[PDB]
Each structure stands twice: as structure tokens, then as C-alpha cells.
């Protein structure tokens, strides 16, 4: 009961993460890039631990955005792997991998890595 | 005594790794890209565990190549983080990060990730 993940999350660079955490471990919702128009909206699906440790630091989760919508297609997918931490300083700490489909895999610009911190309010 | 790391290693895509493991934990030598001419040769420096576990699977190491030589400059650096495993199927298992200097860090094409397996003979 009561995951605290459902709702709107903001990264530090203007992007928005709108998710519902279902009883079952499902994550669904919409990733909106910093441009924040119709073109900037992408489906996200993932999973989370619906029964985290009571001692633990957080709730493991991950999700995927394939960078294709009704408006445009960047022929790529990002996965975020991270942990929800609750409290008045609620956070989703993530690391991400961006893979491009087009790129020969063991060439330049195949897979990018970085990190994102999500908070309940913008910076 | 006797690290088994000193010598020539080949990745699966035509690149060459020529290293000396000093008594002290130093790695020094030359990374040669698949083109295998003068232009393709870069300094490498790193470190390794000069006293690995006797039970253990392997010898932790890492090294850096900054992609600048007398001939050309790709304004970037790769680090390989991995483990030497000895035996008749000797191997260096690595994962790598390639960072470009020029690129705004939290933009597209800042940091690439991949993996390389090094063996004592080419594929």
C-alpha cells in the first residue's frame, strides 16, 4: 500500500516524468522533454519493487522511453535504472543508457550513459 | 612476482594494447587502433592490483588513453575498467567510458559506454 512514486517528477534540466505505479509493479505514463509541447511527449513503461525492504534506503525501479511519438522519431531508446527515496526531500536517483538503433553497435555514438535526479518540484 | 599482464593484448575488433605492469602497480604503454599505422598509436597509463587475492577470479586494473598524439587530436579520453584472468585462455574483461571534452556534458554525445574483451591472440 502507498508507493509514493505515482505523480509528477522533474529532473534538473527542465524534463518531466508523469507516472502511475500500479499495485502489481507496473510503471506507465509520459516523459516530456524540456521543450514541453505536444511534440515533446513520449510513452514510458517500466517496473518497480511493489514490496520494498522496510529497513531499506529505497524502492528499485526502471523505465524505458522509445523516442518515437506521433510527431517525430529519433530511432533510439533510453532506459533509466534507479531508486525512489521518500521523505520531505523525495527523490528518484537514476543512471541512464541511451542506445541508437541506426548506429552500428560497436561504433561511435552507439550507447550513451549519464545520470538524472528527479524531485517533486523543479530547480 | 609475475603479473601475466605485461605484453600485447588484442580486442575483438582489430585494436592492440601494449603494456608493462611495473612491480609498484603502474601500467604504461601504447594503445594502437585497428588502422595500425603511426597515426593510430596513443600513450596509455593506468594502475593494477600488484597483490591480487590467491583465491580470487582476477587482477583489477584500469587505464586511460587521451585521444591525442603527434598526428591528430579527437579531444576525448577513454577509460577501461576491468580484470585480468590468467590461464591458457588468458583474458582482460573490460567496460569503457569515452568522454568528449568539447561536448556540453549534459548534452548528446558527451559520454559513451561499451565493453572490450582482450586476448593474447587476435580473432
Amino acid at each position: 500500500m502507498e508507493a509514493g512514486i505515482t505523480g509528477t517528477w522533474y529532473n534538473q534540466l527542465g524534463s518531466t516524468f508523469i507516472v502511475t505505479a500500479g499495485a502489481d509493479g507496473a510503471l506507465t505514463g509520459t516523459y516530456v522533454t524540456a521543450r514541453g509541447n505536444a511534440e515533446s511527449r513520449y510513452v514510458l513503461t517500466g517496473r518497480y519493487d511493489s514490496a520494498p525492504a522496510t529497513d531499506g534506503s529505497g524502492t528499485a525501479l526502471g523505465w524505458t522511453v522509445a523516442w518515437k511519438n506521433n510527431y517525430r522519431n529519433a530511432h533510439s531508446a533510453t532506459t533509466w535504472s534507479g531508486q525512489y527515496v521518500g521523505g520531505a526531500e523525495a527523490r528518484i536517483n537514476t543512471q541512464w543508457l541511451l542506445t541508437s538503433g541506426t548506429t552500428e553497435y560497436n561504433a561511435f555514438m552507439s550507447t550513451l550513459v549519464g545520470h538524472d535526479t528527479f524531485t517533486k518540484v523543479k530547480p | 612476482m609475475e603479473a601475466g599482464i605485461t605484453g600485447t593484448w588484442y580486442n575483438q575488433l582489430g585494436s592492440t594494447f601494449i603494456v608493462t605492469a611495473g612491480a609498484d602497480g603502474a601500467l604504461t604503454g601504447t594503445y594502437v587502433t585497428a588502422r595500425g599505422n603511426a597515426e593510430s598509436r596513443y600513450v596509455l597509463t593506468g594502475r593494477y592490483d600488484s597483490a591480487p587475492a590467491t583465491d580470487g577470479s582476477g587482477t583489477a586494473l584500469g587505464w586511460t588513453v587521451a585521444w591525442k598524439n603527434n598526428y591528430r587530436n579527437a579531444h576525448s579520453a577513454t577509460t577501461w575498467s576491468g580484470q585480468y584472468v590468467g590461464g591458457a585462455e588468458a583474458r582482460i574483461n573490460t567496460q569503457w567510458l569515452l568522454t568528449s571534452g568539447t561536448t556540453e556534458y549534459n548534452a548528446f554525445m558527451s559520454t559513451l559506454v561499451g565493453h572490450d574483451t582482450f586476448t593474447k591472440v587476435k580473432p
Partner: peptide
């Protein structure tokens, strides 16, 4: 060059 994840 460009990608929506990093757009300003």
C-alpha cells in the same frame, strides 16, 4: 548533433 532527451 541533436536528440530530444537533451533539448533546451
Amino acid at each position: 548533433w541533436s536528440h530530444p532527451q537533451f533539448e533546451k
